[PDB]
């Protein structure tokens, strides 16, 4: 339990990002689009003190601090989302089969995965754009949360655990999020 009487943390907001508050509900608009969330937790008020956004509750308890810093981090993902957006780059890697990745409409379709005759599909969200260039594909969009979800829906579609996991590695995987994951 960290103990302060304010307890108060402060979010630095650029000139590029304007934040508007209406209770516990946050909208963040910059030079490109807008994004809304509801921050829900008891007793945590978000309001704007000048150029600065403040997230506060009177009482310090351990639960609260965690939730408070997550909200700070959601703001921060909006500040670099609404400015210029988020890019995660992904690779489709195949063990045996030229594996055809195309966007047909508001779903991405992956065909010819493991010699399958059937289509695989995975959902794309209304703020996210999927571009395929060769067997690199880059998922691109206004929001990190959203971008992160779309990418992982693609991966969860190709999922394989019904055979050995060392000698079938067919699928599209996360080469990049925003750093490079990972070394074993």
Partner RNA sequence: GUUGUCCUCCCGGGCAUCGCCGGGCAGCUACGCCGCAGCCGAUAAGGCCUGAAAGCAUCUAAGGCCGAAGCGGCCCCCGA
Q: Does 55 bind RNA (CB under 7 A)?
A: no
Element (H, E) at 71: helix 62-83
- 43, 59 in Cβ contact below 8 A? yes
Output the CA–CA distances (angstroms, integers) from residue 128 to 64, 70, 72, 116, 172, in the order listed.
32, 23, 23, 27, 18
Strand-pairing partners, residue 54, are: 10, 47
Joined together, the tokens standing for residue 53 give 């956004």
Q: Does 153 bind RNA (CB under 7 A)?
A: yes
Q: Does 44 bind RNA (CB under 7 A)?
A: no
What's the CA dihedral at 51, 57, 62, 67 to 10 degrees?
A: -50
Q: Does 148 bind RNA (CB under 7 A)?
A: yes
Q: Does 65 bind RNA (CB under 7 A)?
A: yes
Q: Does 62 bind RNA (CB under 7 A)?
A: yes
Q: How far apart are CA 13 and CA 51, in angstroms?
A: 6
Residue 69 or 102 having the CB closest to RNA: 69
User: Where do we find the tokens 């493991």?
Assistant: 114
Nearest to 34 by CA among 46, 19, 23, 47: 19
Q: Does 79 bind RNA (CB under 7 A)?
A: no
Q: Does 30 bind RNA (CB under 7 A)?
A: no
Site string for RNA, 91-130 (x = CB under 7 A): --------------------------------x-------
Could you tell me the smallest distance in angstroms from the CB atom of residue 157 to RNA? 8
Residues binding RNA: number (CB under 7 A): 29
Q: Does 168 bind RNA (CB under 7 A)?
A: no
Span interacting with RNA, options 93-101, 111-119, 129-137, 141-149, rule CB under 7 A: 141-149
- 160, 96 in Cβ contact below 8 A? no
Could you tell me the smallest distance in angstroms from the CB atom of residue 90 to RNA? 11
The residues that touch RNA, with contacts defined as CB under 7 A, are 2, 40-41, 62-63, 65-67, 69-71, 73-74, 77, 123, 144-145, 148-149, 152-153, 155-156, 159, 174, 177, 179, 181-182
């Amino acid at each position: 339990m960290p103990v302060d009487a304010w307890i108060r943390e402060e979010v630095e907001i650029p000139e590029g990002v304007e934040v508007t508050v209406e209770g516990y509900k946050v909208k963040v608009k910059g030079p490109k689009g807008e994004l809304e969330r509801e921050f829900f937790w008891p007793g945590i008020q978000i309001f704007t003190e000048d150029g600065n956004v403040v997230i506060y509750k009177d009482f310090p308890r351990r639960k609260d601090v965690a939730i408070a810093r997550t909200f700070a981090a959601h703001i921060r993902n909006m500040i670099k989302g609404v400015t210029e957006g988020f890019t995660y780059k992904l690779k489709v890697v195949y063990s045996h089969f030229p594996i055809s990745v195309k966007v047909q409409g508001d779903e991405v379709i992956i065909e010819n995965f493991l010699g399958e005759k059937a289509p695989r599909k995975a959902k794309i969200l209304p703020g996210v754009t999927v571009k395929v260039r060769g067997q690199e594909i880059i998922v691109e969009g206004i929001d990190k949360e959203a971008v992160g979800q779309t990418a992982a829906n693609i991966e969860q579609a190709t999922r394989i655990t019904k055979w050995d996991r060392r000698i079938f590695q067919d699928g599209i995987y996360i080469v990049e999020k925003a750093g490079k994951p990972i070394t074993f």
